[PDB]
């Protein structure tokens, strides 16, 4: 019988489809002049509508790739899989929702890359004595957790410009420790020392040849070093089938963007790779510091897990920084960094436990809702993260996507991807807002009262000035008229008090009991 579609959209095909998912449009054009074209499909079949001329699109979630999740990351012919399905083609008509499930699993024995960023100001000298044997001691500890470990090295002090560095006397530019008995290296901003190597003894060999620097202020500019270690993939050597850890060790504050204006540096950091062939951050004295948002974005794009391994007196500060950069960890470092190995192992455990999802390239007309089927079967509505997992344990996520309105472009794409994992799920969204009968619309047709409107999908659609089944009469002087003859007798009411009179032609209003037709709306 009557429904929402019956009395909501009766003017166009797109208006019919936008009313509700259940609406259908009978674009059959042998139907009499004016009919319930827009209503449910079943009664359109009952209305003797042609089965081939019925516009009824059904939203669906079609999977395109469903490779099975891998059991071991050992052997790894670039074929380990951690997210299934991998590609899904989603087709959504407007004001409708579709749901699909994904399964994320942390494959056992996955290769790992560790890049050791180390602050190297003068108060960080004794640490250099308790790191000289980290390549051999970390290889033994992390051999049980993974079968392919690669380790690198870095350094940084601060920008070498104006009030940060000493420029007097002239003998202090060669070594800033002129006043002290000892001598230090000329001050640098960031120098890449050792690229990610499978050989482990190279870390010991290339860390015994280092030496400290000295700058004036207390904060040290390590955010520049983090950015340059992140965006220079080819120089650093980051793998693609591995877990990226960036162990960033410091014992003082850090410089943030706009803090470089004290040196005369106003150009914003653009987040590109500037480390040359001399292994030195070249644009150090010309570009500002990286802000928190840009640093987070570059960490996200390259799949880096950042570990602030900092001393006690500043731990709180970095904790409050770790709440603004998702995916990081904070660890407590001794004065002489005699416990950085255990810090690294525990932080790796904490990274590997949690599973968190993130959405990339999501457009403004789509909304998503997650239901985490975590351990056992206890769904946790609204949650897109699980904690307290192990190695090899799998979690499931149920996703529901809703669309508001008809998007301009019927071909978009976005990504559902666990944070820190290479593997991602790609959704290709197609919006079915336009029916096929609107493509062959014929304008200025004689079928719309001598080209006074467009004739598509079997219905005249005309603009201002005219209205009706075929845009017959004008409303310029239609209100004052003697064409009141819409009933058999003068004393009788118009349309039997059951419809509206338009230009001397009764149109029956909708009824919940059933359909109303007739010249004077006297039928049922």
């Amino acid at each position, epitope marked *: 019988g009557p429904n929402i579609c019956t009395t909501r959209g009766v003017s166009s095909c797109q208006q019919c489809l936008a009313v509700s998912p259940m609406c259908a449009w009978c674009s059959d054009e042998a139907l009499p002049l004016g009919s319930p074209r827009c209503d449910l499909k079943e009664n359109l079949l009952k209305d003797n*509508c042609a089965p081939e001329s019925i516009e009824f699109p059904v939203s669906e979630a079609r999977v395109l790739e469903d490779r099975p999740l891998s059991d071991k990351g050992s052997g790894d012919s670039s074929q380990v899989t951690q997210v299934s399905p991998q590609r899904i083609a989603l087709r959504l008509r407007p004001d409708d929702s579709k749901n699909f499930s994904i399964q994320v699993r942390q494959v056992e024995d996955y290769p790992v890359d560790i890049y050791y960023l180390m602050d190297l100001s003068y108060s960080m000298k004794d640490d250099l004595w308790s790191i000289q044997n980290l390549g051999t001691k970390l290889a033994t500890q992390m051999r049980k957790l993974t079968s392919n470990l690669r380790i690198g090295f870095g350094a940084f002090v601060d920008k070498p410009v104006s009030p940060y560095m000493y420029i007097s006397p002239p003998e202090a530019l060669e070594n800033p420790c002129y006043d002290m008995k000892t001598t230090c290296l000329p001050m640098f901003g960031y120098k890449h020392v050792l690229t990610l190597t499978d050989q482990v003894t190279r870390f010991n060999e290339e860390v015994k040849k280092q030496s400290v620097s000295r700058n004036r202020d207390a904060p040290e500019g390590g955010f520049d070093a983090i950015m340059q270690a992140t965006v220079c993939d080819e120089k650093i050597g980051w793998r693609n089938d591995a877990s990226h850890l960036l162990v960033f060790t410091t014992d003082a504050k850090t410089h943030i963007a706009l803090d470089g204006r004290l040196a005369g540096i106003v150009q914003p950091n653009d987040g590109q790779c500037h480390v040359g062939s001399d292994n030195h951050y070249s644009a150090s004295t010309t570009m500002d510091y990286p802000s928190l948002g840009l640093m987070t974005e570059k960490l996200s794009q390259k799949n880096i897990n950042l570990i602030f391994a900092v001393t006690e007196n500043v731990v709180n500060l970095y904790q409050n920084y770790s709440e603004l950069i998702p995916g990081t960890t904070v660890g407590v470092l001794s004065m002489d960094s005699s416990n950085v190995l255990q810090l690294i192992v525990d932080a790796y455990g904490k990274i590997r436990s949690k599973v968190e999802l993130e959405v990339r390239d999501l457009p403004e007309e789509l909304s998503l809702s997650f239901n985490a089927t975590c351990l056992n079967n206890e769904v946790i509505p609204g949650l897109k993260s699980c904690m307290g997992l192990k190695i090899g344990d799998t979690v499931s996520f149920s996703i529901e996507a809703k669309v508001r309105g008809c998007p301009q472009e019927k071909e978009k794409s976005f990504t559902i991807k666990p944070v820190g994992f290479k593997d991602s799920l790609i959704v290709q969204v197609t919006f079915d807002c336009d029916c096929a009968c609107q493509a*062959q619309a*014929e304008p200025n047709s004689h079928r719309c009262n*001598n080209g006074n409107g467009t004739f598509e999908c079997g219905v005249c659609r005309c603009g201002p000035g005219w209205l009706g089944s075929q845009c017959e009469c004008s409303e310029e002087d239609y209100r004052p008229s003697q064409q009141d003859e819409c009933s058999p007798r003068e004393g009788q009411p118009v349309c039997s008090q059951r419809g509206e009179c338009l230009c001397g*032609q009764c149109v029956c209003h909708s009824s919940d009991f059933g359909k109303i037709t007739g010249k004077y709306c006297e039928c049922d």
Partner: antibody
Amino acid sequence: EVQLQESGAELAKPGASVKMSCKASGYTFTDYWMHWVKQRPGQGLEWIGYINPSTGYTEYNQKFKDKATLTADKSSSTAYMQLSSLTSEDSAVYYCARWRGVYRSDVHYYAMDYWGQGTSVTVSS
Amino acid sequence: QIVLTQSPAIMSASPGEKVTMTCSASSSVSYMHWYQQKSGTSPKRWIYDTSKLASGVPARFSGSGSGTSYSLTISSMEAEDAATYYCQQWSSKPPTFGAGTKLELKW
């Protein structure tokens, strides 16, 4: 306008196919549709099919369906109808009728207008 | 499908007489058109929406009625109006034609 011209009589053996033509001269041949009406020799005018010349929307009649396929040629401005699987009971006169728009008698969509001369189809072996 | 039955199958009248034809529908059709086909098998159009004369029709033919039974009236019939008249409905979606009424002349 308006003149519709039909082809001459066709003799067909049972089980064959027929190629009816209706050549339209006048108006535009893209703003008025075309019907096909069968007339048995014992009275009784039967609606057959339908075609919009711009886009081939062929709505068919009471249990005709595959027994008549309608096509159009907008270049030569001519509407064709193909009868398939002929039987001895299909020996009647086939007309092609236009379709009044603009007014189209308020709601009764049908006005036809300008019928063709009528092509008698004779079926025998 | 709506079935249309024209009650008088064969008629005859003298020149200068009143003639009436009836086409009674089966499902309360709004509007009903009448086609005239002479001897020669080519039915023209004669009346549309059951009260309006198509161009070229004289001012003698009239149509009246509503609901389920319509009628066509001829006043002062000459020898030029002797054909078969068919009724069309097209308010359902079979457009069905009437069986037709034959009209003759008295002599």
